[PDB]
A paper describes a structure:
An ~100-fs pump interaction at 400 nm, close to resonance of the trans neutral chromophore (off state), creates an excited-state population with a lifetime of τ = 50 ps in both solution and crystals. A power density of 1,400 GW cm−2 (full-width at half-maximum, FWHM) was chosen for PP experiments to maximize the photoisomerization yield, based on optical measurements in crystals of anionic cis product absorption. The pump–probe observations up to 1-ps delay showed strong Fo–Fo difference electron-density features, up to 8.5σ, on the chromophore and on a hydrogen-bonded water and throughout the core of the protein. Coordinate refinement from extrapolated structure factors and occupancy refinement showed a small translational motion of the chromophore characterized by a 69-pm displacement of the phenolic oxygen. A 1.25-Å coordinate change of a nearby hydrogen-bonded water molecule modifies the O–O distance between the chromophore and water from 2.63 Å to 3.06 Å. A concomitant repositioning of the Gly155 backbone carbonyl changes its O–O distance to this water molecule from 2.77 Å to 2.84 Å. The larger distances in the femtosecond time-resolved structure suggest that the hydrogen bonding of the water molecule to both the chromophore and Gly155 is weakened. Other water molecules in the chromophore pocket and the side chains that primarily reside on the central helix undergo similar rearrangements. However, the PDP data show stronger differences and a modified temporal dependence compared to the PP measurement after the Stokes ‘dump’ pulse was introduced, and there are no discernible signals that are depleted by stimulated emission pumping. This observation forms our primary motivation for assigning the structural changes observed in the PP conditions to dominating ground-state motion, which is unconnected to the photoisomerization reaction coordinate. The excited-state coherence is not impulsively prepared; it is purely displacement-driven and insufficiently ordered, whereas the cis anionic chromophore product state is seen after full electronic and population decay and thermal proton transfer.
Based on the EosFP sequence, we developed a new reversibly photoswitching rs-FP, ‘rsKiiro’ (described in detail in Supplementary Discussion 10). Reversible photoswitching occurs between a bright fluorescent cis anionic p-hydroxybenzylideneimidazolinone (HBDI) chromophore (the ‘on’ state) and the non-fluorescent trans neutral (the ‘off’ state), as is also the case for the rs-FP ‘Dronpa’. Illumination of the ‘on’ state with green light drives a cis–trans photoisomerization of the chromophore to produce a metastable non-fluorescent ‘off’ state with a neutral trans chromophore.
Numbering used by the authors: 3 to 61, 63 to 218
């Protein structure tokens, strides 16, 4: 069902601290290598009055290198596809809820992303655009009450030698009942903005992910 080379199409609608936006994306990826890259364009609501870095994890764990000895819930979820819901809890009270419904049509993944942020202090690094990047992290994958859950404790690097900490919890659901849940495992991941324009209206985003058993 999943080819070595797949295309990505995206539309995100969202609101952060009452600021509405629409962002489209177009990319490609190698699902078996665990690599994806995409071109994002802000279509409505630009220039965004907050840190683009808070959105970038919302922009598909199908693009993760799974070893033979871990059940790949994401590749086995196609062709019908899967959804996730995610909460982002920042150390200064900032909260985001994001969701993605992922479908496949031929060689293309379609992504319907919704992203809601609130409670970002006006004086903080998100609304003042002081963020520099996400630090690489390990996602803890396990089952909670019959649902595949993933946790991440990570941080944004800020200007001036500081980190801004964020906890992610993500729930994953296949559309097909019957897709067996995997055992617990880890996903190492790195996400980078490769290029941007002045106000992050156009952004090239890269993500690489590798699943492992912690050895």
């Amino acid at each position: 069902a999943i080819k070595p080379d797949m295309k990505i199409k995206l539309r995100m609608e969202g609101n952060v601290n009452g600021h509405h936006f629409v962002i489209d994306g177009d990319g490609t990826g190698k699902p078996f290598e665990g690599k994806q890259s995409m071109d994002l364009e802000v279509k409505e609501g630009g220039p965004l009055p907050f840190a683009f870095d808070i959105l970038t994890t919302a922009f598909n764990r199908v693009f993760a290198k799974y070893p033979d000895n871990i059940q790949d819930y994401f590749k086995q979820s196609f062709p019908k596809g899967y959804s996730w819901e995610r909460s982002l809890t920042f150390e200064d009270g900032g909260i985001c809820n994001a969701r993605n419904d992922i479908t496949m049509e031929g060689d293309t993944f379609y992504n319907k992303v919704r992203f809601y942020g609130t409670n970002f202090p006006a004086n903080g690094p998100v609304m003042q655009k002081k963020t520099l990047k996400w630090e690489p992290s390990t996602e803890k994958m396990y089952v909670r009450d019959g649902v595949l859950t993933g946790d991440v404790e990570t941080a944004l690097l800020l200007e001036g030698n500081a980190h801004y900490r964020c906890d992610f919890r993500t729930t994953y659901k296949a559309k097909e009942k019957g897709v067996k849940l995997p055992g617990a495992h880890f996903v190492d991941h790195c996400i980078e903005i490769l290029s941007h324009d002045k106000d992050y209206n156009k952004v090239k985003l890269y993500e690489h992910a590798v699943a492992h058993s912690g050895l």
